[PDB]
Design an enzyme around this catalytic site. Structure first.
Site, mmCIF file in Angstrom:
data_model
loop_
_atom_site.group_PDB
_atom_site.id
_atom_site.type_symbol
_atom_site.label_atom_id
_atom_site.label_comp_id
_atom_site.label_asym_id
_atom_site.label_seq_id
_atom_site.Cartn_x
_atom_site.Cartn_y
_atom_site.Cartn_z
ATOM 1 N N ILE A 10 0.805 -1.232 0.000
ATOM 2 C CA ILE A 10 0.000 0.000 0.000
ATOM 3 C C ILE A 10 0.834 1.277 0.000
ATOM 4 O O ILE A 10 0.244 2.353 -0.025
ATOM 5 C CB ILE A 10 -1.002 0.035 1.188
ATOM 6 C CG1 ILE A 10 -0.246 0.005 2.543
ATOM 7 C CG2 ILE A 10 -2.053 -1.094 1.069
ATOM 8 C CD1 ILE A 10 -1.136 -0.018 3.831
ATOM 9 N N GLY A 13 8.460 4.475 0.147
ATOM 10 C CA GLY A 13 9.236 5.686 0.375
ATOM 11 C C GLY A 13 10.729 5.425 0.315
ATOM 12 O O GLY A 13 11.168 4.335 -0.059
ATOM 13 N N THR A 14 11.534 6.414 0.690
ATOM 14 C CA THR A 14 12.986 6.281 0.732
ATOM 15 C C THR A 14 13.393 5.159 1.689
ATOM 16 O O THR A 14 14.212 4.308 1.358
ATOM 17 C CB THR A 14 13.606 7.625 1.163
ATOM 18 O OG1 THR A 14 13.312 8.605 0.168
ATOM 19 C CG2 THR A 14 15.111 7.524 1.392
ATOM 20 N N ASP A 127 3.932 17.481 7.605
ATOM 21 C CA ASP A 127 3.686 16.801 6.336
ATOM 22 C C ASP A 127 2.208 16.560 6.140
ATOM 23 O O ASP A 127 1.827 15.506 5.635
ATOM 24 C CB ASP A 127 4.513 15.501 6.233
ATOM 25 C CG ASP A 127 4.654 14.939 4.826
ATOM 26 O OD1 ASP A 127 4.523 15.730 3.847
ATOM 27 O OD2 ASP A 127 4.886 13.700 4.700
ATOM 28 N N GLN A 131 -3.066 12.626 1.436
ATOM 29 C CA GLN A 131 -2.647 11.221 1.508
ATOM 30 C C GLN A 131 -2.151 10.790 2.895
ATOM 31 O O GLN A 131 -2.050 9.594 3.141
ATOM 32 C CB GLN A 131 -1.629 10.816 0.420
ATOM 33 C CG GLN A 131 -0.648 11.885 0.008
ATOM 34 C CD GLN A 131 -1.178 12.738 -1.121
ATOM 35 O OE1 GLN A 131 -1.188 12.322 -2.284
ATOM 36 N NE2 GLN A 131 -1.631 13.947 -0.796
ATOM 37 N N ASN A 132 -1.843 11.751 3.797
ATOM 38 C CA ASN A 132 -1.450 11.408 5.162
ATOM 39 C C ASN A 132 -2.619 11.497 6.162
ATOM 40 O O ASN A 132 -2.377 11.424 7.367
ATOM 41 C CB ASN A 132 -0.274 12.272 5.632
ATOM 42 C CG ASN A 132 1.036 11.854 5.005
ATOM 43 O OD1 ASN A 132 1.152 10.780 4.396
ATOM 44 N ND2 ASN A 132 2.067 12.677 5.149
#
Ligand SMILES: C[C@@]1(O)CCC[C@H]1n1c(=O)c(C(F)F)cc2cnc(NC3CCN(S(C)(=O)=O)CC3)nc21
Lengths: 297, 262
Positions: A10, A13-14, A127, A131-132
Site C-alpha cells: 500500500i 518511500g525512501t 507533512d 494522503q497522510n
C-alpha cells in the site's frame, strides 16, 4: 512476522515499503511499515527513530496508532492500525458529487483535535497532505506518517527549511523565515479545508515562486500592515506583483460565513496571528458539533 | 505554570514527562565493577566530541539521558564497554536532533578505533530496544531554554541574552557529571542552576516552582556553583558555519573534571 500475512503493498518511500497485513488466527488487519537496515549506511534512519519515539507518546483517537516495533534479522517492522482509505482518494471519488458539509465540518473538527493534541505535546507534524489523513468506515479521520514530524522547544530554534509538501507549504517557509512552529501545520489544514469544499487543491504550484504567486493571487500580496516583517524576509522581492485579496465567496463558493471566517484565520499570512488548533475548535463554525466547557479563573 | 494551546495544558504535559521518564541516582550499584567517576569521565568526553562536531547542547543532554537510563536496564558493565555505550547514545541523539548529523564513520573515528561502525549499529539497537524506544525526554538544557524565554518577556521566538544562557549551562554541565543529580527532576535541576545566577523571584516567575520545591537541590548544587564563581564564567564563543543567533546552543567543553574534584 510469524503471524501477520502480507496481503498487499500500500505504500513506498525512501526508507521502506508499507503493506496491508492480516493476522492469521485473529483476522486483525494492520499496516506494516518495513525498514531494511542492511541497506542503510547510518543504521536506523533518523526519520524512523523520531516517528517511533514521538508516536509512543501520542495516543489519541485522531492519530494513527503505532501498535508495535519489531527488530528481525536485518529489518525493522513498524505495526500500525489500518485504515481503508486516505482523504485524497475520498476527495477524488467525491469530485463530481461533493462531500456533504456536515462530513467536511466533522473531518475538520477531528483533524483539529488530533493537531491540538500534537501541538500541546510540542510535536509538529510538518507533512499534512490529503494522503497522510486516513479515514475509516465509521466517520473517523486520523493523522498518519510522522516520518517528517519533530519535537519543538519553547522557544523554538532554527529547524529544517525544506519541510512541507509544496502545495501545503506555508508562506513563512517559502519566504525563507529563520523560525517556524505550529502555524505551518494550521496553514496545511487550511489548504485541505478549502480542498474538501471545492475538490481542487487551493494552491497547486509547480515551483516555489509559482506557489507564492498562487497564494498572493488569492489572499493578496502581503505587506508590512498584514504581516510585520514580510519586506525584511530573505526571499521577499520588492518586484513581487501586487494582487488584491479575492473574496472568499468566489474562492470557496459552497462555504457559509462561519466557514469563510475560520478559513481566513487558518490562512492568515502572519504566523503569530494565524489561529491555533485549540482556538479553531472554539470557532462558531463548530458550535453545532461541540459545546463550550466552563473555564476556571 | 510560569508561561503567559492552553498555558496549564502545555506545562502539565511537560511536568508529566519527567514522571514517565524514570531515572535512578544509584544505577551504578547494579554494575559493581563501575565507580561514579567512570560516568563523569565518559560524559565529559562526550561533551568534548559534541564541541568538536559543533553539536547542539540538546544532543549532549539526550545522549546523557539515554546513557543513564540505559544503564538502569543493564548489569555488570565493564569499563571497556562504556566508550561504545556512550558514543552510541550520542549517535542516536545526533540523528534525532541535528539537521545534518555527523556520519557513522565520524562517530567511529572519534573513538580512535575502539568502536567500529558495526559495533555502534549493534549498540544503538540494544539501547533503543532497552529504552523501549522512549527517546523523547525533556532534557536538563531544554528546561533552561524554557526558563530563559519567560525571563525575557510570545514564548516561541527566541528572545534572550546568549552570554547569560552559556554561564548557566556551564553550571549544569558540572552538576550532570555527578550521579546524585539524578535524584532531582530535570526541571528542578535547571531552575536551581538558574536560581544560583539570579534569585527565587526570577526562578518562580520563569519556572513556576516555589522555593521549597527547589531548596534541597539548591543546597546540593552549592559546591558546584562556588567553583564556577571562583574561576569566573565563560564568554559566548563563535563557531564557523553556525549562525550568530544559534551560537549559544552549541555544546562547549572545559576543565570540568578538575572542578568536579572540589
Ligand atoms: C499514510 C499512507 O497513506 C502513506 C502510504 C502508506 C500509508 N500508510 C502509512 O504510511 C501508515 C504509517 F506507516 F505511517 C499507516 C497506514 C495505515 N493504513 C493505511 N491504509 C491505506 C490508506 C491509503 N489507501 S487508499 C490508496 O486511499 O486506498 C489504502 C489503505 N495506510 C497507511
Amino acid at each position: 512476522m510469524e503471524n501477520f500475512q502480507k496481503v498487499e503493498k500500500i505504500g513506498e518511500g525512501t526508507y521502506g515499503v508499507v503493506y496491508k497485513a492480516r493476522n492469521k488466527l485473529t483476522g486483525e488487519v494492520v499496516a506494516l511499515k518495513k525498514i531494511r537496515l542492511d541497506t542503510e549506511t547510518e543504521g536506523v534512519p533518523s526519520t524512523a527513530i523520531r516517528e517511533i519515539s514521538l508516536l509512543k507518546e501520542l495516543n489519541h483517537p485522531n492519530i494513527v496508532k503505532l501498535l508495535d516495533v519489531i527488530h528481525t534479522e536485518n529489518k525493522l517492522y513498524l505495526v500500525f492500525e489500518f485504515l481503508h482509505q486516505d482523504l485524497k482518494k475520498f476527495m477524488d471519488a467525491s469530485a463530481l458529487t461533493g462531500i456533504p458539509l456536515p462530513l467536511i465540518k466533522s473531518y475538520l473538527f477531528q483533524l483539529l483535535q488530533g493537531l491540538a493534541f500534537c501541538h500541546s505535546h510540542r510535536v509538529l507534524h510538518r507533512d499534512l497532505k490529503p494522503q497522510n489523513l486516513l479515514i475509516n468506515t465509521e466517520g473517523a479521520i486520523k493523522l498518519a506518517d510522522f516520518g517528517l514530524a519533530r519535537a519543538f522547544g519553547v522557544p523554538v530554534r532554527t529547524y529544517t527549511h525544506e519541510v512541507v509538501t509544496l502545495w501545503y507549504r506555508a508562506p513563512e517557509i517559502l519566504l525563507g523565515c529563520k523560525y517556524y512552529s505550529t502555524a505551518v501545520d494550521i496553514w496545511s489544514l487550511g489548504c485541505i479545508f478549502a480542498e474538501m469544499v471545492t475538490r481542487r487543491a487551493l494552491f497547486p504550484g509547480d515551483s516555489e515562486i509559482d506557489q507564492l504567486f498562487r497564494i498572493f493571487r488569492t489572499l493578496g500580496t502581503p505587506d508590512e500592515v498584514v504581516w510585520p516583517g514580510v519586506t525584511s524576509m530573505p526571499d521577499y522581492k520588492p518586484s513581487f506583483p501586487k494582487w488584491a485579496r479575492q473574496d472568499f465567496s468566489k474562492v470557496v463558493p459552497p462555504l457559509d460565513e462561519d466557514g469563510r471566517s475560520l478559513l481566513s484565520q487558518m490562512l492568515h499570512y502572519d504566523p503569530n496571528k494565524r489561529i491555533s488548533a485549540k482556538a479553531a475548535l472554539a470557532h462558531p463554525f463548530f458550535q453545532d458539533v461541540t459545546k463550550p466547557v466552563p473555564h476556571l479563573r | 505554570s510560569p508561561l503567559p494551546a492552553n498555558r496549564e495544558e502545555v506545562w502539565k504535559i511537560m511536568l508529566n514527562k519527567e514522571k514517565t521518564y524514570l531515572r535512578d541516582q544509584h544505577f551504578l550499584e547494579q554494575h559493581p565493577l563501575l565507580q561514579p567517576k567512570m560516568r563523569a569521565i565518559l560524559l565529559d568526553w562526550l561533551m568534548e566530541v559534541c564541541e568538536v562536531y559543533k553539536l547542539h547542547r540538546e544532543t549532549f543532554y539526550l545522549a546523557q539521558d539515554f546513557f543513564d537510563r540505559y544503564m538502569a536496564t543493564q548489569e555488570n558493565v565493564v569499563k571497556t564497554l562504556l566508550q561504545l555505550i556512550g558514543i552510541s547514545s550520542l549517535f542516536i541523539a545526533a540523528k534525532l536532533e541535528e539537521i545534518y548529523p555527523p556520519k557513522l564513520h565520524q562517530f567511529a573515528y572519534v573513538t580512535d578505533g575502539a568502536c567500529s561502525g558495526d559495533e555502534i549499529l549493534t549498540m544503538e539497537l540494544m539501547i533503543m530496544k532497552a529504552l523501549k524506544w522512549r527517546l523523547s525526554p525533556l532534557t536538563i538544557v531544554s528546561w533552561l531554554n524554557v526558563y530563559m524565554q519567560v525571563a525575557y518577556l510570545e514564548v516561541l521566538l527566541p528572545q534572550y541574552p546568549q552570554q547569560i544562557f552559556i554561564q548557566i549551562a556551564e553550571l549544569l554541565d558540572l552538576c550532570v557529571l555527578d550521579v546524585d543529580c539524578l535524584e532531582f527532576p530535570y526541571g528542578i535541576l535547571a531552575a536551581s542552576a538558574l536560581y544560583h545566577f539570579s534569585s527565587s523571584e526570577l526562578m518562580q516567575k520563569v519556572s513556576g516552582y516555589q522555593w521549597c520545591d527547589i531548596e534541597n537541590c539548591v543546597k546540593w548544587m552549592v559546591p558546584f556553583a562556588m567553583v564556577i564563581r571562583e574561576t569566573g564564567s565563560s564568554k559566548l564563543k563563535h563557531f564557523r558555519g553556525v549562525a550568530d543567533e544559534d551560537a549559544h546552543n552549541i555544546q562547549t567543553h572545559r576543565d570540568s573534571l578538575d572542578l568536579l574534584d572540589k
